[PDB]
Amino acid sequence: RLTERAQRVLAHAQEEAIRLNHSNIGTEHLLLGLMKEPEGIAAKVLESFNITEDKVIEEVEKLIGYTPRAKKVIELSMDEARKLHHNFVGTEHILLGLNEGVAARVFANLDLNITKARAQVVKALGNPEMSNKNAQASKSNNTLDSLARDLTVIAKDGTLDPVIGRDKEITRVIEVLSRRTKNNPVLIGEPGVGKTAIAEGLAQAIVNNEVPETLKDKRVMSLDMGTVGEFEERLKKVMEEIQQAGNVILFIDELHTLVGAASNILKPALARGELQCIGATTLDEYRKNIEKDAALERRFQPVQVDEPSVVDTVAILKGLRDRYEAHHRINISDEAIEAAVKLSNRYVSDRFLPDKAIDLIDEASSKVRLKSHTTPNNLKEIEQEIEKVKNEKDAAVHAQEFENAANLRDKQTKLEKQYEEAKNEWKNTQGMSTSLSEEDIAEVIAGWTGIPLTKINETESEKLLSLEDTLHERVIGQKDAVNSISKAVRRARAGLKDPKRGSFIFLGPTGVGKTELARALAESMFGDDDAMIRVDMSEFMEKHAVSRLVGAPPHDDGGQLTEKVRRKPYSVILFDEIEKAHPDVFNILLQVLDDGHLTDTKGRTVDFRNTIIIMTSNVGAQELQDQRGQDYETIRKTMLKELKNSFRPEFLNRVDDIIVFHKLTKEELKEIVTMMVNKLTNRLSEQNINIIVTDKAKDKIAEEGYDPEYGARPLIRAIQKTIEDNLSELILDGNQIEGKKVTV
């Protein structure tokens, strides 16, 4: 199968060739078929060498006023074409054989084959010809309504927003748009990913002739659905007006779902197999547009749009730096841009990199602008004196007195002096000129969350290594448990540890770290104590296994965890004692842990290198008591083996470690009581109460009130009345006035 040249041109010519009792198709059928008028309306590649194509055209039309000569044309053109590496014969190659389709007259205008045509062809479509359509084998070849906003004209003006690194998307769009069935590409991603810039980028490619000119007519128009009542009716009336023009196509830049105002809005109306365009969806809109319909699904091809990388986001922001500077009237630092992109990338979990980067560069810039509102005050004081003096001279002019001698003159010259002073204060006082990187960003982010803000001042030393003391002091006992855990965390530094995957099983008494450590970890690890998520096991055991992961295997069931947990991809998930978990749960944990990913019915993949799970357990009901002469490792191995005998081995094999927790000793009881003092201090030193418990009572109390598998519970009742009622008394006392440190 050849190009459409001399195939479809002929099909059209035949529609229009019903003329002369033609014994067969002659060359003149096509030749005349290659024009709109039997006039020059004359540009074949040999027109430039020796052929008066305008005369050839008149002579061929006059001639009529395959055939044996057409066959010689076909055979010669193709044979020479093969020799010249022109696999299919086009208009610039048909000349090789055009035996019939020439001014075969005395004063002839005849074609060349392997002499000049092969050279003139380079100027024609020529060298860049791999694939199979045509060269627009015609003539010169060698209503746009308000619902069709023209982007290519804006592209031509030069005011559209370019996209960095998204040529693959434009390329794929062109390929899809040309098709008959899967022919409406859609861009996939959340808005902000760069989809709006891609749609605009297409319009730019068109005006810059980076595309074959087809889009010259099939211009980028944007669809403005209009409402402020039914409007689909208008879309249909306009669509008919546009389709009749048959030139331009309507795009969605970022968002489209099925709407109630056909769910496939305007689509059966325009289901003509033409005027293909890029639609645009997100993970959920795709589902709610295309998958939801599932009929027209056969007519779409998603084009996945990734977010720009730090390098690409920085490049667009630096390119756009001039625009932002003009609006902020400040300089925006390049370092600030690099930092804004990087620090937002670390801080924001809510948006794509361009959005979180932009939100930050405007806040950093805004702060410079607020500070720069004025000259780095004394002037204002001078102005206030000027206004005062002005008012006083008003009184001076009005005074109904006998006297520019004294009243008027005094105030007039005082004002003149102050006026010069106001000007001088401005001139010799010549906020911030330019934004900063870490300093402004730390302020913006610290403002938004604070807490060293934790991803700004973290160089991965404090939360990887110093982590051991933070976690241990938060949770007293078995520092070896803590050490194993901090090692698991530091191993992920630079991806030394599998980049796409933490997991621990915590066994022991209550009040020793089985649950306490998971929260302490979230506090340190994410700079967020509420990054810890607790999951009850009965709640998801069997009948509710479907609430752990969304199922639909057998409403919009988000389960209880998939929808909610997904909102925070920076988290510690604490599972209740797993011996209460159903094998389905363990199989789920296994599937989820591998490759670090979310296994659901939505596809909202989470890079789990940003999460960790902690599962408590009491399988080692007696084994945990080995602490009461075995060391950490020996106990660990014993509990590991028993866990293996209960939970699936494959699941268990994805666990970083089995952690030994352990009843606190008196030294440890004193340490947790001490932590209470720190808590009370944090709660009250703010009532301004500083706290020291009389030493006799302090130690006696911590030493006595223990509970082997809870924490120091017996201490509690004596203390609320001994300490809290007393601290209330300190307020009512005044001897041990708040700020002093004495209690019982």
Numbering used by the authors: 5 to 69, 80 to 112, 116 to 159, 162 to 247, 255 to 287, 296 to 464, 466 to 536, 539 to 591, ...
Article excerpt on this structure:
The bacterial AAA+ chaperone ClpC associates with the peptidase ClpP to form a central proteolytic machinery of Gram-positive bacteria. The ClpC-ClpP machinery acts in regulatory and general proteolysis, controlling multiple cellular pathways and differentiation processes and is crucial for bacterial stress resistance and virulence. ClpC activity crucially relies on cooperation with adaptor proteins including MecA, that target specific substrates while concurrently stimulating ClpC ATPase activity. Here, we report on an unexpected mode of AAA+ chaperone control involving transition between an inactive resting state and a functional hexamer as revealed by determining the cryoEM-structures of S. aureus ClpC in absence and presence of MecA.
The structure of ClpC on its own was solved at 8.4 Å resolution using ~90.000 collected particles. Surprisingly, raw images and subsequent 2D classification revealed immediately that ClpC assumes a conformation different from the canonical hexameric arrangement of AAA+ proteins. Attempts of 3D classification and refinement using the existing ClpC-MecA structures failed to give a refined map, indicating that on its own, ClpC assumes a substantially different conformation. Indeed, reconstructions revealed that ClpC without MecA assembles into an oligomeric assembly made of two open spirals that interact via head-to-head contacts mainly mediated by the MDs. Additionally, high-threshold noise on the open part of the spiral indicates higher dynamics of this region, suggesting exchange of subunits. Accordingly, for peripheral ClpC subunits there is not sufficient density to account for all ClpC domains. The AAA+ domains are staggered with a rise of ~20 Å per subunit. N-domains domains are packed between MDs and are displaced so that they lie on top of the adjacent small AAA1 subdomain. The MDs coiled-coils constitute the backbone of the spiral and mediate the spiral head-to-head contacts, which involve residues F436, R443 and D444 providing a structural rationale for the activated states of respective MD mutants. We envision the helical ClpC assembly as a dynamic inactive resting state, which will interfere with substrate binding, association of the ClpP peptidase and interaction with adaptor proteins.
